[PDB]
Structure 1
């Protein structure tokens, strides 16, 4: 099984062979050109209601780690912004680099952040996640940039469990994590229509990318980089540089919620 990954032989420029939509019309991520993105006064404020969020578990899937939520009721929800309807939080994960100068998927005027957080939500009108990903308005992913400087106290709970899920296929109980602790002050955002940034690369995402990055410490991101792509008792490949680069914008407009 020579499966997709991020190395020289199985990384982003190889994905099209198995997933031809990789060269499609609405692929993510993209470079966000701040001078070309237009203020859209019709865009609403983003409504992030995470007060009843229920985390269940954390998993290393060999590509990143996913913190999963119970999405069997309208607990943690995203709405307003560019969205019509209600989208439920299912999981969050991050993408990061081998060094602080790279790691984000989206870029801002070609600037790369040290990492990027993705909070993944599905449109409740489609009833389940698997059905949502087959729809052009099926998912809403909230993207949040990470830069290195001061520690984020709301992240440390995640950092401290990574020891227990070092390799691919390991999981641990991860209850009562509050993702409000990962949010920046301002909910100003850019939005555009896009895709999942890993295979199957489905073109089903309304991207909402926050302008304000959060700060995490060097020590926090260092612990991300101690994870492993490989499974237990296999040769060690550190989980670093699990980001797809910017893809062509083609026939698409990036709108800003702010002036």
Structure 2
């Protein structure tokens, strides 16, 4: 199956997922000079006060922090979005070295990692139906750069030892995702896709301009995870990012002037 290596990585995905060569694939490079302020964007509302985290899972590609999405609790509204999008999970993409790891790039610059908070449009009832819709998902993307530690990330870092290998999970209740945000909600937005198979073209991307800082020690612990399962040869979970894809017939809009 698919992965990030030479023999199963992004350059191979199109053979089983032909939409990999589609018209609205993600990530993209964000050319900041060409992105245009859009006065039609409404204020963005990130409402995570009642979020209910449940579990953290090593799925063999990254680790996912999962939320209870059975009611309107943690939601994203406003900005480019029509209606209410409910938080279901977050995960990261990161590099083997601090100079790469992000999926989106900013004027071609790669960050050390990228956080994706994944939400589905409640008008479609369930995540599975939402991924059959052009406006089914909204992903809030946040860049990570290496500098000072991010206190709200440390609980994640410290549980990774217990989910080292593919298929391992651990309880992860009472985690507040508000601690992963930067100060500013300035953002860029464009229509795109999932960045892993099945690469479905369902996503409104909202990429924050301000990165968060994490410490070298924090990201080094991400890099100690394993792609492999328990009892199998160790393959460090690094470089689990898809490179930028063609922009095609799209425009990136900015929330700021």
Q: Same fold (TM over 0.5)?
A: yes
SS of the equivalent of 1:12 reads: coil
Distance in 2 separating the partners of 1:201 and 1:56: 26
1:90 to 74, 88, 91: 88
Q: Does residue 252 of the first structure (1) align with residue 256 of the second (2)?
A: no
- Aligned alpha-carbon RMSD (Å): 0.3
Deviation, 1:44, is: 1.5
User: Alpha-carbon deviation of 1:241?
Assistant: 0.1
Aligned pairs, number: 257
- Show the counterpart of 2:20: 22
Tell me, in whole angstroms, the C-alpha distance in 2 between the residues paired with 1:8 and 1:108: 25
Q: Match of 1:153?
A: 151
Runs of 4+ in 1 over 6 A off after TM superposition: none
| Residue 41 of structure 1: how far off its partner (Å) | 1.2
Q: 1:22, 1:208 → 2: CA distance?
A: 20
State the shift of 1:118 in Å.
0.1
CA shift, 1:45, in A, is 1.7
Q: Which runs of 5+ in 1 are unaligned?
A: none
Deviations 1:78-107 (A, max 9, x none): 000000000000000000000000000000
Deviations 1:142-175 (A, max 9, x none): 0000000000000000000000000000000000
Could you tell me how far 1:42 is from its partner in structure 2?
A: 1.4
CA distance in 1, matches of 2:148, 2:72: 33
Counterparts of 2:188 and 2:206 in 1: how far apart (Å)? 6
Instruction: Indicate the residue corresponding to 2:39 in structure 1.
Output: 41
1:61-82 deviations in whole A, cap 9, x for unaligned? Answer: 0000000000000000000000
**Aligned-partner SS, 1:13:** coil
SS of residue paired to 2:11: helix
Distance, in Å, in 2 between the alignment partners of 1:197 and 1:85 is 23
- Secondary structure of the residue aligned to 2:129 is helix
CA distance in 2, matches of 1:246, 1:239: 20
TM-superposed CA distance for 1:50, in Å, is 0.3
In the alignment, the residues of structure 2 paired with residue 45 and residue 119 of structure 1 have an alpha-carbon distance, to the nearest angstrom, of 18
State the distance in 1 between where 2:106 and 2:41 align. Answer: 20
Secondary structure of the equivalent of 1:16? helix
Superposition deviation, residue 140 in structure 1: 0.2
Query: Which ranges in structure 2 are unaligned for 5 or more consecutive residues?
Result: none
2:161 corresponding residue in structure 1: 163
3-state secondary structure, aligned to 2:42: coil
Shift in Å at residue 125 of structure 1? 0.2
Corresponding residue of 1:66: 64
Specify the SS of the correspondent of 1:59.
strand
Spell out, residue by residue over 1:187-209, the C-alpha distance to the aligned partner (whole angstroms, 9 max, x if none). 00000000000000000000000
Alignment of 1:141 onto 2:143: no
How far apart in 2 are the matches of 1:85 and 1:111?
Answer: 33
1:215 to 213, 216, 224: 213
Shift of 1:219: 0.2
